[PDB]
Design a protein around this ligand. Structure first.
Ligand SMILES: [Cl-]
Ligand SMILES: [Cl-]
Lengths: 113, 115
């Protein structure tokens, strides 16, 4: 679903440790985890970044968050976690395919970067 | 009460002043009083949800609406170089108010990891 490494993951062309899939999104462990649990939830629709998401995408974006919180519960994150979406250079976005980070299993600190 | 018992419920009902950026029937965006970036605001639902871990399946559109309002407000505030959106869940997430709230931070380089 797109012209990035995450499109290749969606198409199963390169491996990832997949946590959950449905017809419109995919959740998988981050290859460079920043916490004991660190996974991504991505749409299969290639939205390059949250700044270009459309109004009609609202329920899809909320679906990523609902999938994210369900996966976090399944992975035992009962003490809490942090969800992150990066936009652009200042946001530290590393792949131009919208992706929701879910980090847990340790105390997350403030500020969030 | 509409909006709940937390400080964010009082902000929704105009009982406590806030610096409001955007308001509609489903959510409210306002500046954080303890900013962690040159621009730092929150987007909250007007419906009280204590935390993301108890959000219902039917809350999908509302949660997505928070991010759409977040990115529109970021553009209106001139965060053209980018920004970071954050939702904190629970103790390990650093959640400070138990009313779902999306943080939007920008105006400086954000670092990795995100806390
Ligand atoms: Cl990213
Ligand atoms: Cl919070």
């Amino acid at each position: 679903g797109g012209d990035t490494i995450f499109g290749k993951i969606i198409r199963k062309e390169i491996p990832a440790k997949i946590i959950f899939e449905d017809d419109r999104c995919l959740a998988f462990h981050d290859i460079s985890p920043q916490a004991p649990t660190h996974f991504l939830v991505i749409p299969k629709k290639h939205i390059s970044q949250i700044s270009v998401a459309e109004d009609d995408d609202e329920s899809l974006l909320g679906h990523l968050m609902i999938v994210g919180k369900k996966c976090a519960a399944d992975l035992g994150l009962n003490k809490g976690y942090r969800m992150v979406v990066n936009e652009g250079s200042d946001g530290g976005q590393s792949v131009y395919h919208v992706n929701l980070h879910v980090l847990g299993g340790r105390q997350m600190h403030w500020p969030p970067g």
